[PDB]
């Protein structure tokens, strides 16, 4: 039957125009009473590598 | 292809047709595959170990019996047991691209014209649905039953007349299909049937 999109994946991952899988950055909202401002600041998105191939495959649809 | 011979009681004129230049034997084959696929009845079935008649009871203990090791006798290892991966009813049809159905129908006719085995005719004259009457007209037209003919006409009576000839497959104009063209050596339509076929393509 129709395959099912993985809502866990859809809620925390985005596929870009060129088929890249772009996720947020781990480890910045829970224990930072003081990590370097450089640390907490360097939290934009990143690109998963050769294994978004798998993430891609559970969103397809 | 343009050199197609019309046939009137006045004289064997010549009609010019658009008909594609070259044919695509693959596309032609693809249409035939489809035509014969869809008409498939898909009516072959078998019973799985769950659909067989036998009880679900385990046949012997499982240990110390000195015998082998089994559950129910409906298992495929057993003679008279279920059938693994056997056939079930299924639909062999698919939806071949319409733009392709056209093409193939066109090319199929073309190919016939390209070899001159195509012929348009008018009103016949050997109508009033009687095979002997048609058979008489057919003669005066060249069709001597030396090669198979696909007779395409809307006229009910002409078809009645030809139907029974072992060398004639007769068909209505809206029934034009490529498989029937390719089975039959000659292609014989009337004008009120070339018109419909003409509007089918394009």
């Amino acid at each position: 039957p129709k395959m099912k999109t993985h809502k866990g994946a859809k809620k925390r991952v985005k596929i870009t125009a060129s088929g890249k899988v772009v996720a947020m950055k781990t480890g910045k909202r829970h224990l930072n009473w003081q990590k370097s401002g450089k640390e907490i600041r360097q939290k934009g998105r990143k690109f998963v590598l050769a294994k978004p191939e798998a993430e891609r495959i559970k969103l397809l649809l | 292809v343009y050199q197609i011979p019309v046939l009137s009681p006045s004289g064997r004129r010549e009609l010019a047709a658009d008909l594609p230049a070259e044919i695509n034997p693959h596309l032609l084959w693809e249409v035939v595959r489809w035509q014969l696929a869809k008409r498939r009845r898909g009516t072959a079935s078998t019973k799985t170990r769950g659909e067989v008649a036998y009880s679900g009871r385990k046949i012997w203990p499982q240990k110390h019996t000195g015998r082998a090791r089994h559950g129910d006798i409906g298992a495929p290892i057993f003679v008279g047991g279920g059938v693994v991966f056997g056939p079930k009813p299924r639909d062999y049809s698919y939806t071949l691209p319409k733009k392709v159905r056209k093409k193939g129908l066109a090319m199929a006719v073309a190919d016939r014209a390209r070899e001159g085995k195509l012929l348009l005719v008018e009103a016949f004259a050997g109508v009033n649905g009687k095979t002997k009457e048609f058979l008489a007209w057919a003669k005066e037209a060249g069709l001597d039953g030396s090669e198979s003919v696909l007779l395409v006409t809307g006229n009910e009576l002409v078809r009645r007349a030809a139907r029974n000839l072992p060398w004639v497959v007769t068909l209505a104009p809206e029934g034009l299909n490529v498989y029937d063209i390719v089975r039959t050596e000659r292609l014989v339509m009337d004008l009120d049937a070339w018109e419909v076929f003409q509007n089918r393509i394009g």
């Binding site: 859809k10 809620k11 925390r12 781990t26 998963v48 | 084959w29 693809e30 190919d111």
Partner: protein, 150 residues
């Protein structure tokens, strides 16, 4: 042309891979599954795209796309679809969001918004919204109304 003449082109019809037959077939006995355990077993493995063998997977990243929706559901609101100037450069006469569907660019559920990329044309273009770049690009040639009725 003849029935014994049809056939297709080389490929198009490959020969299925009949494995688990006899040796020198290439794939006999172990039927290409190679001895093994779980994967070679019938039902086989869990699901490679997710399962990582017991360790936490990459369900360890935190959703951002905050705003996942709540229970009454998606909120109705006008969806705008952008079509470029280069795209409608093929038309001459009018150009209405209605016509642009038939053409195969608009899509029926969306309102019209023409965008920059492309060069403008001296025609009357009816839409719901115009891009900065687009409003300018064509103001130098043709005229264009904004929509908001019914």
């Amino acid at each position: 042309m003849k029935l014994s003449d049809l056939r297709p082109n080389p490929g198009a019809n490959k020969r299925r891979k009949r494995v688990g037959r006899g040796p020198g077939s290439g794939h006999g006995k172990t039927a290409t599954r190679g001895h093994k355990g779980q994967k070679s077993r019938s039902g086989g493995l869990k699901d490679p795209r997710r399962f990582e063998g017991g360790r936490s997977t990459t369900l360890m990243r935190l959703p951002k796309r905050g705003m996942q929706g709540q229970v009454p559901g998606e909120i109705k609101r006008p969806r705008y679809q952008g079509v470029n100037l280069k795209d409608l450069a093929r038309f001459e006469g009018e150009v209405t969001p209605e016509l642009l569907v038939r053409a195969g660019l608009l899509k029926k559920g969306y309102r019209l918004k023409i965008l920059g990329e492309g060069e403008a044309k001296p025609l009357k273009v009816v839409a719901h919204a115009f891009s900065k770049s687009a409003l300018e690009k064509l103001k130098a040639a043709g005229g264009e109304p904004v929509l908001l009725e019914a």
